[PDB]
RNA sequence: CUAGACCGUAAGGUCGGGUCGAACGGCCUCUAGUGCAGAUCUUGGUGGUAGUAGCAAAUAUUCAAAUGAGAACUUUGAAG
């Protein structure tokens, strides 16, 4: 399948970069059926698409 | 003999990657592990667990460990098999040190 | 129909074709000549060994500045290669001609490649850009391949008067 | 088209055989945009070179799954 469009949609909906969009590898078909931002929103809601938290730039040494 | 068997190996990656170019040390480590499993189990088909790949690339492309403890499980190929009836599956073994360990046979049951 | 020169029985032969095939003509000529005349199953096993680099295709005409290999030994040559794309195309045609042969009713075990022929198909044109704003041709050299598989099958003397008399004389002084 | 035949010193002419499909000759004369190996000739087609020169700047890829006839290169995840 091709989920390149869904990851771009998920980045726009969630508000993060594409680098922060996690699509569940075990839900490829269900993600593929999600073609609208409304469907992406429901997938973010039920956790098929996750926000993939920021990698930390600690200041402790500084 | 027993076509399906699993064993514990430690591989000296230090001598196999000796002199190898820095940007290909980890990719060479992958190829040397596949060659290693092919030599030990006689299987052309070798599949590495992604966690083994993570172990190989832990210190980057240039910092492969000298020795790596591997669990090689020769199994029966299924799911619309390829040419070979058997394949080898390599996954890493969590040990504090990979030194002073001998080849041993793992009991599946 | 209408292949190159063939001298075989069409009743116990089958044939295959691939025209305008995007595969190197020089490589495919060598691959074809490598199995020309072989038994069909021997050639198909041999082509599989070529694919996995256990045996090589000897390169006999289009071979200037090829590398040297020990796998050319069995063919009396030093220059041999492993043209995977040609081998795939040939073994595809071998499969078709085999399918045709047992579709016609021919026996499998007696099949041998009686005729295999590679011809230059029309070239496909591209361009390559050169120093100082020059353009050169960048051409494919496609192949027409045809092959036929066949079942293996299992004066008065004028004498002069002297010669006739000598023969008669030998017969009356010999018994 | 034809290491098949015949005539002419020769330019050439004729015949057989194959291919082919709709027009074309002999002779007497008339007429010319009338005969090619060359012109770094024109246009077009094609070789040897040669499966050769090469496809080496921009640090770098790897494992698995999914898809598919086919995956170094597509997608997803993991990682660097
Ligand atoms: Mg050195
Ligand atoms: Mg060279
Ligand atoms: Mg160029
Ligand atoms: Mg001639
Ligand atoms: Mg007509
Ligand atoms: Mg003129
Ligand atoms: Mg001329
Ligand atoms: Mg002249
Ligand atoms: Mg080259």
Q: Which residues, 6 or more positions from B11, have their beta carbon under 8 angstroms from its beta carbon?
A: B32, B33, B36, B67, B68, B70
Q: Which two tokens stand for residue B51?
A: 């966690």
- The reply to whether C2 falls in a domain is no
Bridge pairing between strands B86-92 and B67-76: antiparallel
- The reply to whether C171 falls in a domain is no
Is B55 (CB) below 7 Å from strand D?
A: no
Q: Which two tokens stand for residue B11?
A: 């591989």
How distant is C1' of D23 from CA of C2, in Å? 30
- Give partners of C (≥3 CB pairs < 8 A): none
Structural domains of chain C, count = 1
**Distance from C-alpha of B54 to C-alpha of B51, rounded to nearest angstrom:** 5
The C-alpha torsion from C24 through C25 and C26 to C29, rounded to 10°, is 120
Q: Which two tokens stand for residue C146?
A: 């045809």
Answer whether C57's CB lies under 8 Å from C80's CB: yes
**Distance from C-alpha of C44 to C-alpha of C157, rounded to nearest angstrom:** 52
> Distances in Å between the alpha carbon of A62 and those of A54, A57, A58, A59?
19, 11, 8, 5
- The reply to whether C175 falls in a domain is no
Structural domains of chain B, count = 1
How distant is C1' of D40 from CA of C22, in Å? 38
Cα of C174 to ligand 3 centre, how many Å?
A: 90
**Distance from C-alpha of C9 to C-alpha of C112, rounded to nearest angstrom:** 13
- The reply to whether C69 falls in a domain is yes
Give A21's DSSP letter. -
- The reply to whether B109 falls in a domain is no
Cα of C125 to ligand 3 centre, how many Å?
A: 16
Write out which nucleotides of chain D lie closer than 7 A to a protein Cβ. 46-47, 49-53, 59-67, 74-80
- The reply to whether C159 falls in a domain is no
Q: What is the 3-state secondary structure (H, E, C) of chain C?
A: CCCCCCCCCHHHEEEEEEEEECCCHHHHHHHHHHHCCCEHHHHHHHHHHHHCCCCCEECCCCCCCCCCCHHHHHHCCCCEECCHHHHHHHHHHHHHHHHHHHHHCCCCCCEEEEEEEEEECCCEEEEEEECCCEEEEEEECCEEEEEEEEECCCCCCCCCHHHHHHHHHHHHCCC
Q: Which two tokens stand for residue C70?
A: 């020990």
Identify the bridge partners of residue B71 per DSSP, sorted by sequence position: B8, B91
Say how many C-beta atoms besides its own lie within 10 A of residue A36's C-beta. Answer: 9
Which nucleotide is nearest to B55 if distance is taken from CA to C1'?
D79
Bridge pairing between strands C57-58 and C13-21: unpaired
Element (H, E) at B85: none
How distant is C1' of D30 from CA of C68, in Å? 74
Cα of C72 to ligand 2 centre, how many Å?
A: 20
How distant is C1' of D63 from CA of A2, in Å? 20
Is B61 (CB) below 7 Å from strand D?
A: yes
Give A1's DSSP letter. -
**Distance from C-alpha of B90 to C-alpha of B71, rounded to nearest angstrom:** 6
Give B78's DSSP letter. -
Bridge pairing between strands B46-48 and C13-21: unpaired
Backbone angles phi, psi at C72, to 5 degrees: -80, -5
Question: Which residues are found with C-beta within 5 Å of the ion, ligand 1?
Answer: B 19
- The reply to whether C43 falls in a domain is yes
Q: Is the dihedral of CA C122, C127, C130, C133 positive or negative?
A: positive
Cα of C120 to ligand 4 centre, how many Å?
A: 22
* Domain span including residue C90: 9-154
**Distance from C-alpha of A24 to C-alpha of A40, rounded to nearest angstrom:** 12
- The reply to whether C163 falls in a domain is no
Method by which the coordinates were obtained? cryo-EM
Q: Which residues, 6 or more positions from A27, have their beta carbon under 8 angstroms from its beta carbon?
A: A48
Length of chain A: 62
Is A53 (CB) below 7 Å from strand D?
A: no
**Distance from C-alpha of C57 to C-alpha of C87, rounded to nearest angstrom:** 9
**Distance from C-alpha of B32 to C-alpha of B83, rounded to nearest angstrom:** 22
- The reply to whether B103 falls in a domain is no
- The reply to whether B65 falls in a domain is yes
Is B72 (CB) below 7 Å from strand D?
A: no
How distant is C1' of D42 from CA of C122, in Å? 26
- The reply to whether B33 falls in a domain is yes
Domains of chain A: 3-51 (1.10.1650.10)
**Distance from C-alpha of C114 to C-alpha of B78, rounded to nearest angstrom:** 40
* Domain span including residue B54: 8-98
Cα of C45 to ligand 9 centre, how many Å?
A: 30
Element (H, E) at B16: helix B13-16
Bridge pairing between strands B86-92 and B46-48: parallel
């Amino acid at each position: 399948a091709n989920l390149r469009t869904q990851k771009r949609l998920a980045a726009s909906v969630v508000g993060v970069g594409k680098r922060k969009v996690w699509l569940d590898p075990n839900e490829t078909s269900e993600i593929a059926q999600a073609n609208s931002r409304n469907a992406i929103r429901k997938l973010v809601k039920n956790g098929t698409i996750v926000k993939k938290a920021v990698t930390v730039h600690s200041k402790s040494r500084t | 003999l027993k076509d399906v068997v699993t064993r514990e190996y430690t591989i000296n990656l230090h001598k196999r990657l000796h002199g190898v170019s820095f940007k290909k040390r980890a990719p060479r480590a992958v190829k040397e592990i596949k060659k290693f499993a092919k030599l030990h189990m006689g299987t052309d088909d070798v599949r590495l667990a992604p966690e083994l790949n993570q172990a190989i690339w832990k210190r980057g492309v240039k910092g492969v460990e000298y020795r790596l403890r591997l669990r090689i499980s020769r199994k029966r190929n299924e799911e619309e098999d390829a040419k070979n009836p058997l394949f080898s599956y390599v996954e890493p073994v969590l040990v504090a040190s990979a030194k002073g360990l001998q080849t041993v046979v793992v009991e599946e049951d | 129909a209408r292949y190159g020169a063939t001298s075989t029985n069409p009743a116990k032969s089958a044939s295959a074709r691939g025209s305008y095939l995007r595969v190197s003509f020089k490589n495919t000529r060598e691959t074809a000549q490598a199995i020309n005349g072989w038994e069909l199953t021997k050639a198909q096993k041999y082509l599989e060994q070529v694919l996995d680099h256990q045996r090589a295709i000897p390169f006999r005409r289009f071979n200037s500045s090829i590398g040297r290999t020990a796998q050319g030994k069995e063919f009396g040559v030093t220059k041999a290669r492993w043209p995977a794309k040609s081998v795939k195309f040939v073994q595809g045609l071998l499969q078709n001609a085999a399918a045709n042969a047992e579709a016609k009713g021919l026996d499998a075990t007696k099949l041998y490649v009686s005729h295999i022929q590679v011809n230059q198909a029309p070239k496909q044109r591209r361009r390559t850009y050169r120093a100082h704003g020059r353009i050169n041709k960048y051409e494919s050299s496609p192949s027409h391949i045809e092959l036929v598989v066949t079942e293996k099958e299992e004066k008065v003397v004028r004498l002069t008067s002297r010669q006739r008399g000598r023969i008669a004389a030998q017969k009356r002084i010999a018994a």
